[PDB]
Amino acid sequence: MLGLKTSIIGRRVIYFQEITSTNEFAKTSYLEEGTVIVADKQTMGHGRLNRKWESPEGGLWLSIVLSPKVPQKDLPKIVFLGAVGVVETLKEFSIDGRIKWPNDVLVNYKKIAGVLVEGKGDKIVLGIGLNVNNKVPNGATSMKLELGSEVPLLSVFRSLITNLDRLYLNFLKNPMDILNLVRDNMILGVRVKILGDGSFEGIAEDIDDFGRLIIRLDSGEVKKVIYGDVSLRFL
Amino acid sequence: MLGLKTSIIGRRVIYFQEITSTNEFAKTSYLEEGTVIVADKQTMGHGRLNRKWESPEGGLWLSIVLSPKVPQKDLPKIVFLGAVGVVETLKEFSIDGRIKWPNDVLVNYKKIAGVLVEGKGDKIVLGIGLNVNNKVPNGATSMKLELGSEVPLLSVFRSLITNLDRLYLNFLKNPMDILNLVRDNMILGVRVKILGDGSFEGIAEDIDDFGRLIIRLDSGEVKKVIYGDVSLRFL
Numbered sequence: 014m015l016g017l018k019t020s021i022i023g024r025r026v027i028y029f030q031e032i033t034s035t036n037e038f039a040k041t042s043y044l045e046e047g048t049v050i051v052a053d054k055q056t057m058g059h060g061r062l063n064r065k066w067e068s069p070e071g072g073l074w075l076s077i078v079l080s081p082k083v084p085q086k087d088l089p090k091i092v093f094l095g096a097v098g099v100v101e102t103l104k105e106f107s108i109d110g111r112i113k114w115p116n117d118v119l120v121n122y123k124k125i126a127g128v129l130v131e132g133k134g135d136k137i138v139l140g141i142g143l144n145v146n147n148k149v150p151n152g153a154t155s156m157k158l159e160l161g162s163e164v165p166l167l168s169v170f171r172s173l174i175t176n177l178d179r180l181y182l183n184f185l186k187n188p189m190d191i192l193n194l195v196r197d198n199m200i201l202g203v204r205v206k207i208l209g210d211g212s213f214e215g216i217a218e219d220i221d222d223f224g225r226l227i228i229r230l231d232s233g234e235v236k237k238v239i240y241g242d243v244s245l246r247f248l
Numbered sequence: 249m250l251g252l253k254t255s256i257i258g259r260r261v262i263y264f265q266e267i268t269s270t271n272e273f274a275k276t277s278y279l280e281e282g283t284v285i286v287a288d289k290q291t292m293g294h295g296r297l298n299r300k301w302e303s304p305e306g307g308l309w310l311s312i313v314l315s316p317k318v319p320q321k322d323l324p325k326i327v328f329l330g331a332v333g334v335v336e337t338l339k340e341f342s343i344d345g346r347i348k349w350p351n352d353v354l355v356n357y358k359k360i361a362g363v364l365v366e367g368k369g370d371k372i373v374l375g376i377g378l379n380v381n382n383k384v385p386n387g388a389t390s391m392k393l394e395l396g397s398e399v400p401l402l403s404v405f406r407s408l409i410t411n412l413d414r415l416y417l418n419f420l421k422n423p424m425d426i427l428n429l430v431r432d433n434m435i436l437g438v439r440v441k442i443l444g445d446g447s448f449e450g451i452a453e454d455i456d457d458f459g460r461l462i463i464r465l466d467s468g469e470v471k472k473v474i475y476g477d478v479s480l481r482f483l
């Protein structure tokens with residue numbers, strides 16, 4: 014009854030009033046590619062590492078099941094599909110979102126969405142959390158806060174699924190295309206701090222052909238950061 | 249992201265752009281009580297006694313998994329929950345839906361919806377097919393044809409699910425209650441022909457305390473029809 018016209022992503026959609034985590038459900042259950050897992054709220058929303066993702070009602074919390082027949086080298090770009098897709102849907106709603114490497118979407122520097130990719134077996138789970146009408150943690154923002162009025166969640170859902178379906182289909186044919194869209198939509202030419210041990214600081218110059226953030230330290234040294242137990246903070 | 253507020257029916261919803269039959273999928277798959285299976289269109293939709301059910305895009309084709317904790321004697325009343333639920337939704341949209349024993353809902357004697365209940369052990373699948381905006385076979389009707397305008401499919405879904413949840417919750421507590429609702433909404437006091445092992449004609453006067461259709465033949469003889477391998481036709 015949703016009448017989705019997408020080719021792959023959205024062929025099936027499993028909705029929950031409540032759930033622990035759409036990402037967890039997605040990787041522990043057998044699902045055909047393109048299946049979307051979505052819930053009104055998550056009791057155990059997951060961020061990177063052991064971080065929690067606040068998932069109260071009013072937001073868009075979903076996971077998509079993928080099984081891309083592309084070289085292993087390209088898989089790390091899946092997170093960018095989610096991020097660019099969010100940016101595209103925000104634009105449709107007249108909101109300018111900017112990507113903060115490697116998985117965040119910011120609006121005027123406030124986090125409005127986060128992307129979490131997990132790969133179990135030949136299956137890949139693309140998780141996306143977008144604040145729409147829900148209240149958010151201090152420092153974050155939502156579509157409702159940016160526009161001044163509630164946005165129909167289903168309208169956002171349809172827009173995002175349509176955008177992701179297109180990005181994904183192109184990704185399967187032209188896997189390097191997404192990087193271009195990312196460069197044109199991410200925060201660069203600014204100073205950042207790379208936490209963790211070996212912690213350093215420098216200017217985020219660009220992302221390379223593998224999706225690595227290229228940083229120029231004050232000494233002129235160039236480091237290439239791969240995203241994992243990695244965290245980027247502005248300063 | 250649908251934001252359903254029902255207690256049981258609709259705790260989860262599995263949507264398909266296309267499927268063979270929601271009733272088949274619901275009977276076959278391991279699903280929790282309250283889970284709703286809905287598809288834009290069915291390729292192998294069916295009615296009773298191996299009959300085909302046209303399921304083109306525009307209609308509401310869904311199945312609900314239930315595990316009614318009531319005496320085995322009350323299970324046959326489940327089909328009425330479906331029919332009454334549809335009638336209420338139709339009335340909310342100002343369409344005069346009336347129940348035709350045993351599983352149909354008509355508008356001016358033209359079928360607009362059919363209910364098919366299929367029986368496992370502790371699991372019951374409540375299937376409902378309601379013509380909304382889809383083309384229908386000659387002699388049938390749709391909400392769109394009745395209203396002279398297209399109706400938002402999602403609004404009909406929300407209405408029906410809300411009604412069914414309330415009706416189901418009450419059924420668990422008072423299994424006899426639905427019979428009153430069936431009586432106030434069923435086509436009665438008219439001449440009907442019952443088809444089973446042979447056939448006979450008479451006035452459909454009412455349903456009894458077991459949901460059996462009471463027929464009064466011209467001889468004054470009273471027969472009690474149990475819905476099974478039988479068919480009812482108006483003269």
Ligand SMILES: Nc1ncnc2c1ncn2[C@@H]1O[C@H](COP(=O)(O)OC(=O)CCCC[C@@H]2SC[C@@H]3NC(=O)N[C@@H]32)[C@@H](O)[C@H]1O
Pocket residue numbers: 033034035036037055057058059060061062064065066067068073074075076116117124125126127128129140141142143144149150153154
């Ligand atoms: N609702 C919210 N809005 C903005 N920021 C939030 C937020 N909830 C938590 N945060 C902050 O963002 C950080 C997490 O950032 P990270 O970069 O590590 O992680 C993320 O940004 C990924 C979030 C992925 C969420 C989706 S929801 C659908 C699916 N199911 C799941 O269980 N997860 C995925 C937290 O440590 C918080 O400080």
Ligand SMILES: Nc1ncnc2c1ncn2[C@@H]1O[C@H](COP(=O)(O)OC(=O)CCCC[C@@H]2SC[C@@H]3NC(=O)N[C@@H]32)[C@@H](O)[C@H]1O
Pocket residue numbers: 268269270271272290292293294295296297299300301302303308309310311351352359360361362363364375376377378379384385388389
């Ligand atoms: N779309 C339609 N609208 C009105 N009448 C139809 C119709 N499609 C078929 N019919 C007629 O209705 C008869 C079927 O009547 P019955 O009383 O036996 O059976 C029914 O009326 C039950 C139909 C149940 C349909 C739902 S759709 C969701 C779920 N998944 C399924 O596969 N089935 C259920 C057929 O033999 C046709 O003559």
Ligand SMILES: [Mg+2]
Pocket residue numbers: 350351352362
């Ligand atoms: Mg019938």
